[PDB]
Amino acid sequence: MRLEKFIHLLGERGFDGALISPGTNLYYLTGLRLHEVGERLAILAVSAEGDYRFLAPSLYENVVNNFPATFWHDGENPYAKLREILEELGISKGRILIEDTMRADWLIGIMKLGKFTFQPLSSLIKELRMIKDKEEVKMMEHASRIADKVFEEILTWDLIGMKERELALKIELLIRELSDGIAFEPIVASGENAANPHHEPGERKIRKGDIIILDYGARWKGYCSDITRTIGLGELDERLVKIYEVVKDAQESAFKAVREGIKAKDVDSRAREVISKAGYGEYFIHRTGHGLGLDVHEEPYIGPDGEVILKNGMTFTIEPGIYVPGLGGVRIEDDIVVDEGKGRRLTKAERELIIL
Template sequence: MDRIRKLQNMMKDRGIDYVIIGPTSNMFYLTNFSEEQMERPLFFVVSEGHSYFLAPKLYEEQLSKYNFEIISYADGEDPYSKMDLNTNSIIAIDDQLWSVFTINLIRKFNPSNLIPASTLLKELRMRKDKEEINIMEEGLKIAENSFLQFLNNIKEGSSECKLADRLEEIFKENGADGVSFKTILTSGPNTSMPHLRCTDRKVRRGDVIIVDFGIKYRGYCTDTTRVVSLGNPSDEVKKIHEIVLNAQESAEKAKNGMKGKEIDSIARGIIAKAGYSQFFIHRTGHGIGIDVHEDPYISQDSEQIIEQNMTFTIEPGIYLPGKFGIRIEDMVVMGEKEARPLNKLEKEIYVI
């Protein structure tokens, strides 16, 4: 309730009439209720003096324990006509709400302006409280122990996807509620594609293996990347790993009050100095919390000032197309003076 009051205060300050939240991380943040998006509108609507769920009738009983007003509609009824929005208003729309709902809201209420709700909500969500940080640290313990346990499963001839599945099973066995994203486990030349998930490729002796993994635990996400080598890594792999590690550890020491782009430039500068700037093809990191990617972003264009209790990743990488890629990723929290890693897992190449 405190979070909703804070949101209402921000709305008042900025002249925003309504905030429309879908069944996303924002709904969980504001109401503690969590659901996937579907074709039936399920909104949490906030205005100055009012907040309520607009929900399909079949959610009525389930929502009743959340202690918010519920306005429900039956299948076949028009949900939008049950909403009390004035036309020509300023509406903040949940960034992840499906566009079909926004199009319908535009048609029905003809707003004078639409803005992404993240402009309000990110300011609340970026700064984590103690409990949120604790939950993420607990989640990381499960994720890291699972990774270590998983290493014994990596055998020549196993396919990337089979290995990724096995790691996800171990997460579950160790108490994870699920994954925060589909595990990335790539090998050999596939590692130069940073967002490829996995393929049928069988891992071979001499392969670099990149494991980028995260779990969901009590509503919060983890995100970590480590490098594995099946057999001794080549000199080139060792050299690139050292550059990336240096970039990662330097950026991880970011100071309170730096801008996102300043932290990015620490990592980017080290990689550029080593002569690989064109092979670092993504930003240095992203905020993490209920969403695996959220504000603040640690990117070349981020003017966001990184303050105490913001949690984010530091994950530089170098990708040599057709050869291999190396990325190392920790989660960090900004402290009073400087950031500290939430991960404990060591960052050397795991040689198997």
């Protein structure tokens, strides 16, 4: 039903076709999932007229089930074969949509197969992936349930003396034990390191009195969870303890604002005000949240520039934070779904400051 919707949306937006290499959009539209395609051309070609065919390497003729395909064996010109296909479907010319993540060398080769005008696939497919159906929501619910479990386990561990890199690996292994896999490399940021929102876990040793930001995600049947919790070891610097209650206030505030009909930027400003009034405006260096589903980052974005009007079925994160260089930082992140016109938390983990 999705592929058919997408096709309808294509015509209505004036496009003549789309070329979709392996990834989440391909999966979304067909359920197809190839393992490590690499440099071998694999492309789902779709006509606005309703016709479609998937060109893939002979190696994958078992994973493609009975999906309308054409294979090419090592030695053939995949690109020439694709051209044949584009000819049948009648799209060897026109305004074509291209999967955002496709390798540039594939697009370059494809550029020689006809007169085309390109556009990123997401400019249009977001309209579909942004509104989660009932099953997708159930899936994101389970992934959030796992993200919660992992937090509970981490709290029974002995962190003192562990290096960030080591803690992150334990988390990753735990997530690979509980689910399909990590939605992204876990992030552990302690002490002063928690001041950089995009910090990469390293050799810093966690000690008594260290604040710790933990950000990780699990995948469940393709859907992702993304949760962040900030914990303290022993007694935290009083300046960070204060900061924490504010961030907590900012997040709960942005959450209560979640209503069908309100603009995304308004959910952002709601957290942003709480943090400005407390005086830490200059330390909240990123958006309040972003959407999630099959990818960690997708529409809609919850920042000062978010123009999307929230509607039921949308799923995104609410994770404001405060970062102070040389001191540390705090972030609390929840995964949210718009349900019955209201904001509902998919993740339930403890939001109060936890002093291990």
